[PDB]
Structures are given as structure tokens and as C-alpha cells.
Design a protein around this ligand. Sequence first.
Ligand SMILES: [Cl-]
Ligand SMILES: [Mg+2]
Length: 576
Amino acid sequence: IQSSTILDRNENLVEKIENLEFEREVSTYFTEYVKYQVAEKLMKKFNYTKEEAWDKIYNGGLTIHSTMDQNIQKNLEKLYADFANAMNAPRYGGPSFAAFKRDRASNITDEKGNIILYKKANLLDENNNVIIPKGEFSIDSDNSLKINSQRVSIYQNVLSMASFYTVNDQNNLVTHGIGNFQLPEQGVTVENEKSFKISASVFENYKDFYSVNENGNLVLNSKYFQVDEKGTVQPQSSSVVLDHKTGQLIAIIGGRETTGHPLNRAYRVPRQPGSTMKPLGVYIPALDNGYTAATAIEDAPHYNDKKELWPKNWYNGYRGLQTLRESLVQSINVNAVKTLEDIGIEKSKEYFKKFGLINEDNELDDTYVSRSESVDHNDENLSSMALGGMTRGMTNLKMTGAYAAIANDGRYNEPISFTKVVDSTGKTILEPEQKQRQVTSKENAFIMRDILKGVPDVMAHGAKHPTIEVSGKTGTTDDVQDSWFVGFTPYYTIGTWIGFDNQHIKLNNNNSMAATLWGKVNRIVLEGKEPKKFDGPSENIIRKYVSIRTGLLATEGTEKAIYEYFVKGTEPTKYE
Ligand SMILES: [Cl-]
Ligand SMILES: [Mg+2]
């Protein structure tokens, strides 16, 4: 009788769950993940199937006490709804922030030249009908249709259409999809995915399916290929706000759209993390394996196993001997690869597991491709685990939850979106079991936060907060395909990604634009919070005046020397 409801962290109603396969005040981003996570935790507890667990969510009269802070979630959606204006999207040139290749007819293509997004007018007519130009369709004497164009593809007897782009009132790119049509079981002969013939015995049950116009072009009916008229605005962004002390998820944004049921990229669409992988894949393990924040690493020409100048740093050159602190702050690629070469790829996989990037149990429920999952294209790589050029990437949720471990004194907490589920009678039938695991020592977590505190002044001025200390790491992937910033204040851990859904389109803003938005997200999350600084050093950390050339205690006359944090027992005892 009763209906299932989701509440916020203050017991306020947020969704009345109904099967669609009151007036909402927030987008479906947060509430979708609640139901997703509740379903997983329900299957584990009661040995339910996907269907059995969802039948309980739909019709079980359950009240889900989610962790959402509705005001933060609402306000962050204000920002994302106003993405174009907040990020100063240029409005007079080409599509805002978009860097892509176009053909002479203004269709967006890949690097090779294949069309990936048609200009709407080149693909659709005035009635949202697909037009196939002359020379790419033929009707034989048997009134059967032959199509051989890049606009239509066929696979498993299902006609799939190409996708097109528009440009909205704010000069932002908007990509639309066209639906598919299930061609009958028999009546089609295929040559390649782009060349096929449909026999007239199929058009008999339809008849209104195609039409040649006054220009000898084939016109397919929109009633069988549904046109996504609203589309999806580009570039897209996602943010994840997390209380690292408890692992509770405070707000989730999975895209710019805030109405309908938009794709929640925050946990469903992995992307390349880039240099944000360096702290938790390389240097955090290094600090537990014989490295200190003052350890000198030589930024010098490095070569791969095939005698090629790999990798290349972002600054076209080499900076020479740099401490571990500077190697991470300056995001040196050579020093990151050299450090992951010293420690193991296997030693790194241990931290991928502990940070939650690798699911120790299923290992197919993760976005990491192991040697078991693949031998040709796997993630057991130096490019993947040191530079963030992964086979599939990581989701924003996994990256934020891993950085939250650094913020939470090196202790990982599985991000939970609910605290209890209450049935009709009033008993708690579900309470999440937070997989709490210690990734690194409390001391190393502090040192890493202090190292990454120097990143905003060097690469992310937009992330700096007026009254609350900010520590984080930037990530720009190859060709500015992805822009990342993941970090934390004393209060929350936040992760922000910006990029185009179609990775062939790149960004023309290589000015850490995700970090600029991250600051806007952080300022909204921290509204009303008192000024606060990061926690002080533990009693197991000593400070020493050391030389950057080695790591040894600096004396007078030492050229370059600073005071650095050391875990007690790792500081140098001898002098330069
Ligand atoms: Cl530099
Ligand atoms: Mg895997």
C-alpha cells in the first residue's frame, strides 16, 4: 500500500519511488546512486537478484535515509545549470571550449577523417527525417531498398543511425542521438555494417517507411528513428562531494543537465584520470617504501623499453634534480614514471586495491583491466598507473573516494549514500557496511596533504578558497581531452572533471579549467563554514633543514635548502 521514499540527511522527503520502466526538487543524480547502492547492498544481504532487489525497492514500502545534503545538492545544480555563464563560455566564435576537426560541410570528424557528428541540416530535413543523398541509396526492380552510406549502420538486424550536433543559445555544442529500428528477422542481406539491402517484404507491414524527394534523395520516416530533440550539452562536467571523515556522500553531480533522467557520469562513465593518478598510484606508495618528501628525483631524458623518448613532460624540457614534493607539485611525468619503476607495478596494484580503484572481491565490478582480464590491452602499465593514461579510466566517484582516504588520515572509507533503510513496520532492514581500510599511515597522509597544498599556487589558482585551506592535484590528459581536479579541505573531499562526452572532441582551455570550476563547487559546499586550517602535524613527524640536491642535513653554505616534514625514523642523520 505505502510507497517507497528517499530522504535527505535531515529526514526531508526527496523522492517518492515509482516504477517508470511528488514534485522533485533535485536532479536524479544523487537519488539514482542511492537506489543503485541500496540495490547492491540488498542483494548482498538477502541474496536477492537484480530484479528481486528492485522489486523490494519499488513495492516494499521502504524509507531510505540517504546522506544527501539537499541545500548543497540544490546549489551545486544551480552552478551546473549555469555552467556556460559561470565558466565564461565564449559566445561569438565556434562552439564553446570545443576543439575538433571538421569537414568542408561542417561535420565533426575524428583524427582520421571519419564523420562522428553530422551537422543537423546535413542529416535531417525539416521534419526530423533522415536524408540519404543520391548515390548512396538504390531501389532495384524488386522495390527493395539498398543503402550504402556512413549515415546508417546495421548490426544484428538492427538499423542504427548517426548522431548529429546543434549549437544552443549559449554557443555550446549540443550532441543529439537518433534512435534505432529493429528490422525483421528475414528480409535483409548484409555486406558490411554500412552497406545492406532491405527487401520489400519488410516495407509491407510499414509502408510509410521511406520516400524519394524532389532531389532524388532517400527520406526515412522519423516515426521509426526517434530524434533526441533536447540532446546533451557539451562539454560535460561532474562533481563528487564527500565527507572523508565518515565516507558519507554529500552531493553528486553527474552532468550539466538537471531535469529528466540525465546520464550520471559521476559513477557510470569512467574517464582518464591523468596526473591525478600520480599521488595515489605512485607517490603515496613511495612514501611507504623508502621515499621522503625531500627525496631527489632526476627529471632527465627517459626512454621506454623500445628506445623512444617516453614520457614527455608538459613543459617541453627537463627540470633536473627535483624533490618528491616538487616532482608531484610540478606534475613531472619523468619523475612519476621513474618512481613507479623503482617500486613495483605490483606494489602499486596493492594501493589501487586499498584505495578502492581495484575491487578486491569481484575485480570485474571495477574499471581496472588486469592481466587476467586482458593480455593485449591491460592496465598493468606505467602509462596507466603512473601517468593516468588508463585503458578505461576511473570514475569521479572512485577518484574522490580514494583521495578522501588521504584526507581522512590515510584511512579509506567506502563512500556510502545512505545510512539506513526502514520497512513499513519501522525496523531497519538495511544498514550499509562501510569497508574501512587503512591505505597509509596518518603521518604520510599529512605529508601528502601538505605537498599538494602547494599545487593551487602553481597550477590551480581557481581552486584557492578565501578562508579555508585547500589541497589537491590537477589532471589534464593528452591533448586536453580531460580536465581534472581532485582535492580536499579540512571539511570535505571533492572531485571535479570536465570534458567532452565524445573524446574525439577536445578542450581548447588548457588553463586547468576543472580546477576553476572545482573552486566554484568548493565555495558552494563550504558556505557558512567557519575558517579552518588543515590539522597540524602528528607527534611522529619531525622537521629538518635539508638540501634539495641530496636529502641529507644541510649545513651553512648549502645552495638550496628548505625545512621539510619527515616521518620520525626517516629523516637524514648525516650532513651534506
Ligand atoms: Cl616547469
Ligand atoms: Mg577489473
